[PDB]
C-alpha cells in the first residue's frame, strides 16, 4: 500500500471564505483539483497544511466526507486539527478528466502574548497554491461577570458539544444561594460519564469520573447536583457559605445525535446575588453552539 | 494519572459598538 | 496518581450588545 | 507514579459590556 | 491660582435672543491693572450645564500668542472654558487681552407651547443673560428632509443625516436618494451609519454597515464614491414601505477657515395617496464655528 503526495501537481485552487476573521472564528477552506496535470492513481493523496505552532494556530475541526461519485467511493477527504489529507481508492483508476474539492471548516486562533488590539496572519498551504488569513485579538474586556453560559465545540471532537456554566467567576463574595436550571434543548444527548466540576479559589478543586457529582455534594455541604437524563435537564443549587470566594466551573458534553442539524441550544436560569450589585431571579442564560460544515465533491468521465 | 481540569474560560468580549444617534427633534413653526 | 496542570485559556468573548439610542435632537428650521 | 497531563482547552469567555449611549439626535424636519 | 475674579474686565454675549439649537458668540476681556498675571494663572468662564436652560460650549483650543511667543492657552469645553498661562507672560508689564467664542444655546423645557428662559453666563463677577426660544412642535409630515449639524464636542467633522420615509408610510416606488457632498470637507466612511425603525427594526454601524445593511434588505444598495464625495441610496418599495431609514455620516473638515459647509440631495418616491416626486432638490446648509484669542503685551 504505497501513496503519493501529488498537491504539489494536481491543485487547481484554494480558497478561503472569510480573510479577516476574530479569535476563536470559524473559517471555509476550499481546495479544488484536477488530473490536467497528472492522472489521479490509487495511493495519491493531497495535502493540505497550515500553520500549527508558534504565535498563530490553525486548528481544522475534525471531520470526514468521502469523495463519492454513482455510489463509488473513489477518495476519501481526511481533517485533522493539524492538517488535511485526501487520500484516493483503487475506484478511481477508471476514470478521466477527474476534477473535484474538499471544502471545510477550520477555526482560527491568535495566540500573541501581547497587550492591546492585535492582528496576526496564517498561510494555509496546499501544494502550489498559498492563501493569506488574518486573524484578529480584540483588547481585553473588563473583568466583572458573575454568572454566564457557554458551548464549545473542539477541533479534536465533533461528535459532542461542551457546555459550561460559569458561576461567580470574579471570585466575589455571594449573599444569596446560587440555583441554575438547565434545560438541554433536541439534536443532542447528556452524557453524566463527562459532567466536572472546576472550583477555584478558596475552595478550590477537580471533581470529575463517577463520583464526581457525589464528591462535590460532599466536599460542599448543601450544594446539590440533579440530572434528568430522559428529560436532559440539570438543577444545580450551591450554597452562599461556599460560593463566596469561589468560581464553579460545570463542564458536560452531549453527544450529537444529528449531524444533519445546523446548531445546538441549551437554555439556563440563574438565581444568584453578588454582594454590592443587585440580585437575579430567574434570568434567562441561553447559549447557541454553530455546527461544522464540510464537503467534498468529484466530478469524473468513465471508459 | 489523572489528566488536568479543563483551561480558565477567556477574556471577556470587547465592547458594544456605541448607540444609535438619537431620534429626530420636533418640527418647526412659521 | 498525581493530577495534571490545567488546559490553557481558551477564546475570547462575543462583542457586547449594540449600546441604548441617545437623546432627542433639537427642534426643526423655522 | 508519573505526573498527570495537561487538561484540554478552556470555554470562549462573557459576552462584553453593553455599550455606551448614542450621541444626540439630528435636528428635526422644517 | 484661580485669577476670574480679579482680572476680568467685561464679558459680553452677542446674540441676547435666540432660539433652541441657536449659537451665540461669548467675548471675555482681562486686564493687569488689578494685579499682575503669573504662571498657572486661570480664567474660568462658566454657564449653566444642566436643567431647563442649558449651555453648550463649541470645543476649540485658540492660542494666546504675542509676537511669535505663546504666552497663554484658551480651552473651551461644553461645560466650561478655561484660559491657563504659561510661564512666558512673566516678561510682559501692561497686558489686555480677550477670548470669543461660539456656545450653543439650548432650551430643555418640556412644557406645551412657547417658552422662553434665560440663561445667565458667569466670568469672575461679571455676569450677562441669555434668551432660549422653544417654538412648539408641528403637523408637518415630511415624507424626505436632509438635516446635519456639528456637535460641541466634535468640531472637527460634520454630522449629515438623511433621513428616509419619517411617517413610515406605503410606498408606490424605490426610493432613490443622490448625495452630492461639497467642497471643503471629506467623507468618513466610518461613521456612515444606517438606522432603519418601524416593521423592520435594525441599526447598523461601522465598517461593514453598508454590507450588513444590503444583506439584511435584499434589493437595497448604498452606492458610496469616497473621492468623488457622492452617495447614492436605492430602497425598493417593498422594504421602504412603513420603514423610517435614518443614514448618518460624519464629514472631516477640511477648511477650518471656511464659514459654512453645504450638502445636496435629489430624492425620487412615490408615497401612496400623495404626488409622485422626481428628482426634487434637498438642500441643507451647516454653520461652521469662529472662535478667537488675543493677547496684547508689552516689555
Known sequence: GSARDISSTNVTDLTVSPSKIEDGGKTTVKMTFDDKNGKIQNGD??????????????????????????????????????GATITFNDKVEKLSDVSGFAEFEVQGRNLTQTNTSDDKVATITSGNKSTNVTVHK????????????????????????????????????????????????????????????????THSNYYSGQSAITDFEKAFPGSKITVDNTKNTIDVTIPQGYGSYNSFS??????????????????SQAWYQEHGKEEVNGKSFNHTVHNINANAGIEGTVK | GPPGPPGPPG????????????????????
Not at chain 1, 50 to 68: D, N, Q
Open chain 1, 250 to 267: 460545570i463542564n458536560y458534553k452531549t453527544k450529537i445525535t444529528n449531524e444533519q442539524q445546523k446548531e445546538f441550544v441549551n437554555n
Open chain 1, 138 to 201: 480584540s483588547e481585553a474586556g473588563t473583568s466583572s461577570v458573575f454568572y454566564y453560559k457557554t458551548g464549545d465545540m473542539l477541533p479534536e471532537d465533533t461528535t459532542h458539544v461542551r457546555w459550561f456554566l460559569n458561576i461567580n467567576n470574579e471570585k466575589s463574595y455571594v449573599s444569596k444561594d446560587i440555583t441554575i436550571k438547565d434545560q438541554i434543548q433536541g439534536g443532542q444527548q447528556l452524557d453524566l460519564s463527562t459532567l466536572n466540576i472546576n472550583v477555584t479559589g
Open chain 1, 45 to 82: 493523496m493531497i495535502k493540505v497544511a497550515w500553520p500549527t505552532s508558534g504565535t498563530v494556530k490553525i486548528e481544522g475541526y475534525s471531520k470526514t466526507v468521502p469523495l463519492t461519485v454513482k455510489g463509488e467511493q473513489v477518495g476519501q477527504a481526511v481533517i485533522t486539527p493539524d
Open chain 2, 11 to 30: 477574556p471577556p468580549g470587547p465592547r458594544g459598538r456605541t448607540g444609535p444617534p438619537g431620534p429626530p427633534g420636533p418640527p418647526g413653526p412659521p
